[PDB]
Each structure stands twice: as C-alpha cells, then as structure tokens.
Amino acid sequence: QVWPVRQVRPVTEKLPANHPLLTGQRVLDALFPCVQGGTTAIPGAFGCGKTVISQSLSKYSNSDVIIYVGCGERGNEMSEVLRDFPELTMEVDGKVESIMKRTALVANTSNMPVAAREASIYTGITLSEYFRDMGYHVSMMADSTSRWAEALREISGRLAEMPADSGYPAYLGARLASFYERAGRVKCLGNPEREGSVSIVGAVSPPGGDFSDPVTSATLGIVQVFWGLDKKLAQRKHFPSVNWLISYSKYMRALDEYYDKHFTEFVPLRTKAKEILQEEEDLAEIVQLVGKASLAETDKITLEVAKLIKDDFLQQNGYTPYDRFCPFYKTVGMLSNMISFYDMARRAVETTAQSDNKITWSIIREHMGEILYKLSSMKFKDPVKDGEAKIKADYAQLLEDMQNAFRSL
Amino acid sequence: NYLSQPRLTYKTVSGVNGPLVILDHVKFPRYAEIVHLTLPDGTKRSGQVLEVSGSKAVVQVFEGTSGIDAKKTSCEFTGDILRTPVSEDMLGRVFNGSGKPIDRGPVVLAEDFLDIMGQPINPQCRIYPEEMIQTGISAIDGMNSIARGQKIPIFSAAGLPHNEIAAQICRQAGLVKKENFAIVFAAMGVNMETARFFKSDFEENGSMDNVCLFLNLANDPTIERIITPRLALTTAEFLAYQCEKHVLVILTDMSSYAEALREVSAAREEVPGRRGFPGYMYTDLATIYERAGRVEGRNGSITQIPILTMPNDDITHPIPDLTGYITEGQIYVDRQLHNRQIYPPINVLPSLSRLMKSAIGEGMTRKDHADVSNQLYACYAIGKDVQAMKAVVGEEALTSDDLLYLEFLQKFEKNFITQGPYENRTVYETLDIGWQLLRIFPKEMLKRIPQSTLSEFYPR
Amino acid sequence: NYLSQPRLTYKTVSGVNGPLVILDHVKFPRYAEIVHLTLPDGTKRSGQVLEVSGSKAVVQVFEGTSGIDAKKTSCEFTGDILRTPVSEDMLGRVFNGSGKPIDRGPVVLAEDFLDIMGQPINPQCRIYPEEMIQTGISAIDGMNSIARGQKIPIFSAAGLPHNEIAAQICRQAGLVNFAIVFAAMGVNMETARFFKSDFEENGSMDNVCLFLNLANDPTIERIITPRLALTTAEFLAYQCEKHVLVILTDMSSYAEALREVSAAREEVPGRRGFPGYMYTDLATIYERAGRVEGRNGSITQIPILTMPNDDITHPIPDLTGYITEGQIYVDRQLHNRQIYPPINVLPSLSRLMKSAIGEGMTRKDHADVSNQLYACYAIGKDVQAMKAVVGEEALTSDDLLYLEFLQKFEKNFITQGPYENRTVYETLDIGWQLLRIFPKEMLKRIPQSTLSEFYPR
Amino acid sequence: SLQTSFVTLDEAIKITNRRVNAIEHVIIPRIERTLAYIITELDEREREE
Numbered sequence A: 001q002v003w004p005v006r007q008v009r010p011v012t013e014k015l016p017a018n019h020p021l022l023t024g025q026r027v028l029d030a031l032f033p034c035v036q037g038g039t040t041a042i043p044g045a046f047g048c049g050k051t052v053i054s055q056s057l058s059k060y061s062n063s064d065v066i067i068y069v070g071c072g073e074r075g076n077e078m079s080e081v082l083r084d085f086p087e088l089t090m091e092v093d094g095k096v097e098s099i100m101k102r103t104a105l106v107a108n109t110s111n112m113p114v115a116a117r118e119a120s121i122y123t124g125i126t127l128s129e130y131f132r133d134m135g136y137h138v139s140m141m142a143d144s145t146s147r148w149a150e151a152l153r154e155i156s157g158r159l160a161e162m163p164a165d166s167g168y169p170a171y172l173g174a175r176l177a178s179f180y181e182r183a184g185r186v187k188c189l190g191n192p193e194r195e196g197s198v199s200i201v202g203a204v205s206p207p208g209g210d211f212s213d214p215v216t217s218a219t220l221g222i223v224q225v226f227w228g229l230d231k232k233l234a235q236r237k238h239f240p241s242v243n244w245l246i247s248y249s250k251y252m253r254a255l256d257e258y259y260d261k262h263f264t265e266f267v268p269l270r271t272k273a274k275e276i277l278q279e280e281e282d283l284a285e286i287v288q289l290v291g292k293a294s295l296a297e298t299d300k301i302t303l304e305v306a307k308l309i310k311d312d313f314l315q316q317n318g319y320t321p322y323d324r325f326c327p328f329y330k331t332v333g334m335l336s337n338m339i340s341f342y343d344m345a346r347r348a349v350e351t352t353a354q355s356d357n358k359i360t361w362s363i364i365r366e367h368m369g370e371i372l373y374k375l376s377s378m379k380f381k382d383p384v385k386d387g388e389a390k391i392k393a394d395y396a397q398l399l400e401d402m403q404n405a406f407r408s409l
Numbered sequence B: 001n002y003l004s005q006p007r008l009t010y011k012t013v014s015g016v017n018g019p020l021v022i023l024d025h026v027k028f029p030r031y032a033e034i035v036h037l038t039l040p041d042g043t044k045r046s047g048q049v050l051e052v053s054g055s056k057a058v059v060q061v062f063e064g065t066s067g068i069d070a071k072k073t074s075c076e077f078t079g080d081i082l083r084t085p086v087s088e089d090m091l092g093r094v095f096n097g098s099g100k101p102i103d104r105g106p107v108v109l110a111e112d113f114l115d116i117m118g119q120p121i122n123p124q125c126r127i128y129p130e131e132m133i134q135t136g137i138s139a140i141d142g143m144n145s146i147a148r149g150q151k152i153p154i155f156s157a158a159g160l161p162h163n164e165i166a167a168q169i170c171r172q173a174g175l176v177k178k179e180n181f182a183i184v185f186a187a188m189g190v191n192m193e194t195a196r197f198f199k200s201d202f203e204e205n206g207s208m209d210n211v212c213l214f215l216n217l218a219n220d221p222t223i224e225r226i227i228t229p230r231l232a233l234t235t236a237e238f239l240a241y242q243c244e245k246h247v248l249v250i251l252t253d254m255s256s257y258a259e260a261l262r263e264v265s266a267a268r269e270e271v272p273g274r275r276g277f278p279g280y281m282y283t284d285l286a287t288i289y290e291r292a293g294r295v296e297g298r299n300g301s302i303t304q305i306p307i308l309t310m311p312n313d314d315i316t317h318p319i320p321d322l323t324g325y326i327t328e329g330q331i332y333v334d335r336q337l338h339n340r341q342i343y344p345p346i347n348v349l350p351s352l353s354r355l356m357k358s359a360i361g362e363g364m365t366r367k368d369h370a371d372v373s374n375q376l377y378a379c380y381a382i383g384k385d386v387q388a389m390k391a392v393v394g395e396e397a398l399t400s401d402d403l404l405y406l407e408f409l410q411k412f413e414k415n416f417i418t419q420g421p422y423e424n425r426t427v428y429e430t431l432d433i434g435w436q437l438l439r440i441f442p443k444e445m446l447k448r449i450p451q452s453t454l455s456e457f458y459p460r
Numbered sequence C: 001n002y003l004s005q006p007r008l009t010y011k012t013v014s015g016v017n018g019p020l021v022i023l024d025h026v027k028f029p030r031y032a033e034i035v036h037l038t039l040p041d042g043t044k045r046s047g048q049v050l051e052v053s054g055s056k057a058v059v060q061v062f063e064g065t066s067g068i069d070a071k072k073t074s075c076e077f078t079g080d081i082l083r084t085p086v087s088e089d090m091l092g093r094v095f096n097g098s099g100k101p102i103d104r105g106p107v108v109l110a111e112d113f114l115d116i117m118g119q120p121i122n123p124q125c126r127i128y129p130e131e132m133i134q135t136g137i138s139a140i141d142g143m144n145s146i147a148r149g150q151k152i153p154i155f156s157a158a159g160l161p162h163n164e165i166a167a168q169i170c171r172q173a174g175l176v177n178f179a180i181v182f183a184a185m186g187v188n189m190e191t192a193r194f195f196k197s198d199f200e201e202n203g204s205m206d207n208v209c210l211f212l213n214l215a216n217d218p219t220i221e222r223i224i225t226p227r228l229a230l231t232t233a234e235f236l237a238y239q240c241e242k243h244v245l246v247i248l249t250d251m252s253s254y255a256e257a258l259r260e261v262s263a264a265r266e267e268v269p270g271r272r273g274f275p276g277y278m279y280t281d282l283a284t285i286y287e288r289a290g291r292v293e294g295r296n297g298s299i300t301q302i303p304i305l306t307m308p309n310d311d312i313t314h315p316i317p318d319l320t321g322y323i324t325e326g327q328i329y330v331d332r333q334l335h336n337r338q339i340y341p342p343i344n345v346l347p348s349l350s351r352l353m354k355s356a357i358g359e360g361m362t363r364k365d366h367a368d369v370s371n372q373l374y375a376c377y378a379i380g381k382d383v384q385a386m387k388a389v390v391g392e393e394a395l396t397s398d399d400l401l402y403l404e405f406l407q408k409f410e411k412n413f414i415t416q417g418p419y420e421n422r423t424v425y426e427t428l429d430i431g432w433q434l435l436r437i438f439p440k441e442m443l444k445r446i447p448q449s450t451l452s453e454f455y456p457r
Numbered sequence D: 001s002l003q004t005s006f007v008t009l010d011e012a013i014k015i016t017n018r019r020v021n022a023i024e025h026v027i028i029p030r031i032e033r034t035l036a037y038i039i040t041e042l043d044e045r046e047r048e049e
C-alpha cells in the first residue's frame, strides 16, 4: 500500500500509556521513566552520548519493532549499527535471533542533500505508524531533530521568508509539535480489535551547548520526558552524562500503579534517592565556600551516600560486558542496598550522637571498608554470566554483611 | 433584512504561500470577509480576507494551503464578515477550534448570529467588580484574591502543573459565605493528554451540563487559533449579557495563540516587533483580554483566566510582558517550588491581583484580611533575603531574629502555600492558618499591622 | 562523450557589486558552471555561476572584482562544472590554492578529470575503521586512540604548537607508509616554510602533495582549496588503493572566508555571523574520509583549528566537534608551563577508540587503564581547585594522593619532547605506574580480574 | 588570656583568608563569565534585528 508521509495514519482511539519503555540504563529507568507511547527529548552538547543512548535503547528495549532515523548525522554512526545488529541476538522460544530481524533504518548523513532531512523524518514516523496499526509496540529514534530544523532554515532562507528566533521560520514550532503528536498508544483501525503504540525519542543538538536554543526551547514545550545531558559529566567519563537536577519525567504518576504490582518496594527507594541527591546539591555550595569542617555527621553521611549513588549506581559504562544492559531486578536490588546502608549509617549516628561515646562517619568508614568495597562492586555482577538467582543471592548477602557490621557498633 | 443576492465564485487564484492564498479580478472586495475554498478533490476549506487592494484580495486559510493550486481550486465569497451561531444549548457541547461539533451531536440551531469581534462596551456602562471569588486555594485567596469580573492570567512554563491549578480553580470556585459558574473553556495547541485531562475532570466532577469546550489540539491547524478565543468569548458574552449567567472563561495557552499570529505576520512580510512577533501584538491581545467584567442593568458577568507557557521561564518575553500591561494581575507558577514537590508551586512575590484591595476586608470577608496579607508578604520577602545571605556566611552569622524569619519561611511554604489537589480552604481557614504563622514573631516585629488588629487577633 | 560544440563568449556584463558579476543575454545558463573572465588590461580571472534566472547568470569571481568594468571585460563559459585533473604524478608536487603548479614543474597530465565537490559514499558501502594508528604520542595513543580512516581535528589557538604536533604525527604515524595530502588556507610564509622544510628534512617529500594558499593570496580560493586536496585523496585512496593522511591547515581560515563570501549574498546568519548552512558545508569536507567495501585504500583526516579567544563554544570548534569523530585539544595553560605536547586530555575525545583497542587489538587492560587515568585526572583537578580556596592544611591524605598523581601524570604520561616515539605498550605501562600510587580499592573504574593481573607488577 | 585570645584569633584569620580566596577564585569568575555571556547574546539579538 502507498501512503502520503505528511498525513497522520488514522486510529479508532488514542489511549493513556500504562507500561514502561525499559532502556536498560540505571539512571533513566529508575530516576526518569518513559512509556510505550511516550515522547522524549535528549538535548546535549557534542560528545555527551546522545547516539550511544539511542543505540543502547535500540539494542535492549522491550519493543516489538525499532525504526532508526539518522537525518543530518555521521555515516560512521550508521555503519556501526549495520555492523553490530546482525551479530547481537535476542532469545525467542529457547532459540536466538538477530535483532536486525526487528529493525529498519532511514539514513541521510550530514553530507547528503539538506532538503532530504525533512523527508527522512516523515518517512520514519510513517513507517512507525504502519507497524503500530498491526498491533506492535514500536520505538522511533530520531538521532538529531536540530538537523531538520537547520534544514528548514536554509530552504526558508532561499525562499526569502522573514525569520522568527535566530533565523528559523515561524512555523518551526508547529512542524515540531505536529510530529510529536504522532506518538501514542492506540486502538487500531479495523475490526480484530488490537492495540499498538509508537514511542518517539528525539535527540536535540543545541549549538553552543546552551538549552536556550530555539529547537530545544520549542521541543521542551512539547515532550513529556527530558533527559538533559551535561558536558562536565561527559569530560569525567561519567556516562550516561544525564544531569539529574534538570531532567524530568511526567509519567511517574501513571507508572506508580505498575510499580506497586510488579516491583512493590521501588517507589520509596526512588523517593529517598532523589532526596539524598537534592540534599547533597544543597550541601555542595556550602562545602565549596565554607570548607566542609562545619558539617554534622548526618550531612557527612549524606554526602558520602550521594557520592556512592553518583559513582556506583547512576554511572554505567555502555560497552563493558556486565553493564551493556542492566535489568530492573539488578537496578532495584542495587538501589535497595545503597538506600539501606544510608538508613543504617544514619540510625547509628542518630541513636548515639547524644552520648559521651558516639559514632562518626570516620568510625563507620574505618569499621566497614570491606562492605564499602562490596557496595562499589555490585555493578560488576553480570546478568547472563551470573544470572538472576546469583545476583539476588549476592545482594541479600551484602545486606547481612552490613547488618553484622552495624550489630557490631 | 438578509443578504438575498447570489455569491460570486472565482477560479482566479494568483499565488499561494504559507497560510495565504492571493486572488485577483475580485469584484468590490470587502475587508475581513469570509471565503469558502473548494479544492480540486472537492475538500472544503475556509478563510478570511486580511487585505484588499483594487481587484486583489489576500486570504488567510484556516485549515492550511496544502493541496491548493492556481487553476482548479475555486473561492466563493460570502458577502459578509465572520458571524458565529450562538445558543444556551451550547452548554454541555464539545466543538473544535473552528466551532464545528466533535461530540457526535448536531450543529448549533441558532438563537442568534454574532460577530466574533464583539461590539465595544461603553466605559460609562461598566460596573467595578467587588464580589470575591473564593477559589479555595490559600496562596490565591489570602494574598492574590480574585474579584468576580476580573481578568487574571496564570503565568507558568514547560513541565509545571498549571493545568492542575486551572482544573482545581474550576472545581472549587464560588463566592465567600459570611451562584455557580457556567464555564467556557478554550484550548489552543494542547496535546491529547491535556484535552483528555480537562474533559475527564469536568465529567469526574459530574458537571458537564454547565460547561462549553472549544478544542484545537497540537495536530489541528494553527491558523484556527486566530479565531478560537473569539468563538469562546463570543459565546461567553451571549451567556453572560443576554442569558444573565455568571461565566468563567479559561484560555489554556495564550503562547500558542501568539505563535499563530507570528506565522501570519511573517507570511505577510510585515515590520516586526520584539522576537519577531507582530508590531500590533498588544492591540490584538487586548481585544481578547478586555472581553470581561460586568455591565450596568444586566445580572450576568464574565471572569477571565488565561494561561501562558513562558519560554525559557523569561517573564520579560513579549507574550507575558504585554499580558501584564492589559490584565488586572498575574498568578506565577515557579519551577523552584515545583522541583521541591510543593503544590501549588505559586510564588507569592511576582504574583499580583490589582482588584483585591477593594474585594477584601470588613463586610466583604474579615477586618484583618488586608493587614495579614501585607505582613505575610513582608515576612516572606525578608525571609528570602535572609536565606540568600545565609548561603554566603553560614548559620553562625545569623541572629535569633534571622532564625525567626528563616523558620517562618519554612512554616509558610509547608503549611500556607502547600495544600494538595482536592483540599478546599475557605478564606477564614486561609486567614487563620496565616495567623498561626504570624504568631512565630513577638508583636513588636509585626510592623505592617495596626495595634487594633494585633489586639483583637494575636492573643487567640 | 567530449564537449565537441564550441564555447560562447560574452561582453554582456550588466552589473558588478561586491564579489559578484552579473551577466545577461546568456544562452541556457547552467548552475555551478565555471566562467573565465578577461579584464581590459588582459589579466585572466575565474568565477563560478552562483545563481541563474532566465537570461541572467550571477558569477562569484575567485580573485575578486577590482578593475572589472561593464564594457571591455569579456566572459567565456566553459560548458561544465568545476573539475580538477588528477594523476598519481601529484605526489611530490607543490600547487597553489587553485591547483596551479608553483614548484617550477609542468601542469598535470590527467589520468582523469574529477568533480571537485566529490559525491556522497553510500552508508551501506562504508567499512567501520578499527585498525589503530600508533602516533607514539602518549596523550593521543593511550587516551584518544586514532583508527585508520578517522576524522580527528586538532583544536588549538594562536601561539600554541599545533604545527609541531601535526608534523610529529606525520613523522611518527604507523600501525600498532601513509601518502600525505596537505592543504594550507591563509598561512604566513614561516608556517609554509616549516612544513615544506620538515617534509624535505625527513626525506619524505617524494610522497607528499602540497596545496598552498598564503595569507596574501585570494580569499575565495580558500573555499575550493580543501576540495581540491580531498579530490586528490579520493583518487589516491579509492582508485590507486593507497592509505592517505589528509592535513587541512587552519579550518578557521576556511570558515572566515566562507562567512565573508556568504555575507555578500545576504544569506541567513547563524551564531556569531557565520552562514546558516555552515554545519552542512563543513560536513561536505569532513565526511570525505574513511574505508569502503572491496578497496584496500583509506582516507584519514586531521584538520587543524584555531579557536577564537580560546573559546570551544565558538561556532567553528562547536560545529566541527558535532561532525568529527573526536578532537585533540591543545591547552595554553600547559604550553605556558613549558610542557610538550600541550594536550589537555579532559576536553579531548576519540569516538572510534572504543573498538580499535583491547584484547587482540592492543592489550586487555587498555580500555580499563584509560578510563581510570581520566577519573584520577578529573579528581586531581577538583582537589587542585579545592586547595586554591582552603589551603594545604585542609586536605586529607586521600586528597594528597590525587594531587601527587596529578604532578606525576603531567611529567611522565603527557610530557614527551618532539622526537620521542613511545609504543602503545610503553604508554600502557607508564599508565599502570601512575595508577599504582593509589591503594587498589580506590581504582573503582577497574574490575577485580584486571587489577589482580596487572597492578602487582 | 593571651593564648585563649590567640587561639580564637588564629581561627578568625583562617576564616577571613578562606572568604578572600572564595571571593577571588569562586565568586568573581562566575560573575565575569555571566557578564561576558550577556554582552555576547546582546550582539546576537542585535544581528538578528
């Protein structure tokens, strides 16, 4: 069949989204969730990891089909996908299958004709709506929407049109908003009564790295999830380079009733982790100006567990074999142990700080260096070489290992 | 009398560009006239004459110019400007941004046809509004109080919960007790989840028989936004000034309206204002915002609550900037309060209501309401200055009085501002939550309050 | 088939303004065609058709419009777009920025005439680059490894030694010979002498091709100079099967000439007044690199940049970093401290490094050691920044370990001197020695199985 | 008397020097970067106009 790429394919009804799009990152899946039918933006300066997040999400997500769009970006970033995806396999019925069997690609690299970048976007979303109508859950990656906005600026410029913000045409916001409205979860047309979805994950490439960029500023008015990357995390090799202070998701109130059924313990842990990071951010300016010696032992513990979470939970190298993909059980198990250590270390100080003989974080460190090195090592446990049972058994052993040390204070 | 004479139909299309079609050989063209376009495939669109000169007319097309051509497409000129049908049967109906039904009901069988620009109400014939709307929200009713017949926007930004504040005002609004609103709701450029949220809330409240909805979603045509506020306000003016209802009008993103103006102005190659917006943006916005309030000898009223998404959180941007020069206040929704899970995220410092001065106080609400609002404001202003100093110097530099202001700042955000989405507080609960914070200080610090108000309400 | 029908010549110049000449009564104009202009004094100049409309053609003139007139100036239209004559004789030649010889040798006998603009390679036919080049420079090889076929520019600034680093890379590159194609845009004569001298001093010059546009040469030649050079690299790599290293000298001179050309046409500006399409334009140069299916040859690009006021957010380094596969960053603060090479690793990157290293490629530790050296260097910088506020008496011994690593890293791993040629294996073991300072439980980028094999030596 | 004064005064010298270093190395650079950005963006708005 033949369809006009600029016209939305019809459906019986759009539906609320009720199920997570798992990315296999610990950050993203815990702190800033996304859904089957969701809309996401990934803004960030050059080298932050936008294409590596797009490729990781393409390799490891819970989607039936992937449509991958590379408008205005590198030919080697397309060639990597063609080289990798035949070799990498998912498992079906006790049999392995190449993930290239579920993938389609739409390439228009940074040296191909500028006008064709508009056609890449509408081709890729039309291909995504076609498989949605079969009752599949589809994900579309658009590895830079700034390259499309920048193509509109040249065509608009040669048509001699009046510019809006920074040379872009006044219709740019309407072109973006009507593209993101093609995402969703649906009752399909026709009569076998199936349901399907399209999630859209649009990367954004703000010139100068500043999110006051017209494309970023327009896109953040439209999307429901924002994964804002930071170059000063990327320079430390802190990956994914996501700024957890500015990033957000609007789907948390929709997903809480899923987590209450499948991962009952997670919502308190998510709440505590955000508070520990928010407290460490409030402490860090006082530490920088005043020089740390003023801090109470609660605040030393809060800085130390915030550092533990930042360095050994949020951080995840995407190439090394144990952390390519992090399952949600591994993610909840790791988080539960770090938050449980916070509550035990705080309990020990908060119970004893009134007495003549009392606990301090220096005592806790010196007493527990082996348990601290076990907590930092939890990330190295491997989802396929060790497996679920061995991972969950080890994380329960760390809980007794730290409990015996706190029974011993 | 009627237009009984026939309508001319022209195939003389001469240019097509963005939202605009240009025709020539047009007989005695009329400015602001409506045009109906039949495409080569028989699709029907509609448009309006933005300029006339000699035999040439420039038409903005509401549904967009895709598929139009310079030979087969034909325009029928209606002989008249845009008049909408109206009736009281429009309450409990759902329409698109063009005013066509989407509830699967019939089209409006009119009680009248009204010009969507309205008619100028004489400044001699207006009534000054003094009845307070109790919105049920303490940060509004205590410090930014709203009169029935006011124009007062919510200024907000991307990701913030301005839709929940709007829905909560619609659930909870009434007069202070020592009538209930007809609601007209317009949406420009909203996503499907926003449209579903408001429609679902009015059904959840069990009150859809008293509300009219006009919806233009983010996939619907952008030039329909030019008329959507004017369909909504023309309906509110019939209901208020001919059927004597008390109307509340919600206009849910003025920022996506102002962008549709910038497209048309850019396509016409007009001389810019700031950030590329039309040079006439103030004078256009004023035609929407000044359709509000009360008139002498008629029992109904219109209260206006626009909503703005401010870009980059910039309150000096031409959209929120010009809105303050026309409306009687603003309510400001703040990212720093939202990031801390405070709800409502209303920041009381940049928020204002210009008509509150005469709507509150003795006989209106309670005799302390003016004094308590001033003192709560001054305490929060001082506490925010102490907080900003403290981060430089540490708590060892602060006096016992600086700790009284810094304690108040927490207790105020925790108890007075923070409320939750279905909690409804009277003015009386709002004031007496207020006094529990003013008791943090000794009497000698409460400088905004006269001794009679201290003597009567502090000892309790 | 050959263009056998004769060329038209025109005196119909209807106007002149800025760098643009405007002919009328032109018979069937061709967009992007080349035109030869003869001035009244008999000087020849060339230009290219930048616009066509009915009987009119707009020409930009490469040597400028000064002294052109509406009456005596005459234009000959070539019937064709800009093509360059190419042969394998071009190695061991020197040309100006428009491809005319300047070595007192003859003009090129073509093996073919190639379109200067190249042609986009199909992403299906690209081969991902995975063979590591050893430059022997430890700050590159150990922490920004270069794959054969990469684009990896040198971001530098005025007064820094980016010429000397680029010469050292040309002198030392090999697998764990290159043909060199070198372009210069807007160089002073002492820069032009430095490279030509160094290539003759290393005896290499019979295997180097140079295109020179100096600071006094025409500006609009600069926008064809890298396209002449890359067309020569594409013949040498993808028809003669050679491995080519292409050096493009000061891309900020290319971008500045492009801004000056575009400002005369009044095209939409981007940031800091550069053309709205500058990303696309630079991408047509930088994407002319890599390996391809079924052919042995390859093109590696190392463009050199000058950052205005050392600002990496300026559109030139910014839009270049968005396209290229990393960057090497040359730092004024290391240069002022008399270190060589001044390569600050933190703002630097290589994207193709991740698959060009490790087991079978280099050594099993390489991917772990590199990431731990980045972590300790970033933390050492944070402690040095803390010390400037609170003074040494506030620092714990753990802070002093990172601040000792910092001093030893810049003296042993970074500092090298201009002719030292370290193996990857020397670079890796110099890596482990600095990491050995820290008690092993601090090495939290490295898994137990790597630590227990390499740290105890 | 002199020694308890001296201990108190030593701490006050250390605190004062810490503040001077913070103004010189944290606060003034942050203001000067902010000021340079504002001066840059005002030229961009002017070129757009």
Ligand SMILES: Nc1ncnc2c1ncn2[C@@H]1O[C@H](COP(=O)(O)OP(=O)(O)O)[C@@H](O)[C@H]1O
Pocket: A044, A045, A046, A047, A048, A049, A050, A051, A052, A053, A239, A240, A316, A317, A318, A319, C350, C351, C352, C354
């Ligand atoms: N999750 C990650 N894990 C490991 N390395 C990463 C990760 N994300 C980014 N990188 C490194 O950073 C480089 C640049 O990432 P990329 O996605 O291409 O950034 P960009 O936003 O510019 O497209 C990668 O080639 C890789 O070397």
Ligand SMILES: [Mg+2]
Pocket: A050, A051, A073, A143
């Ligand atoms: Mg990318």
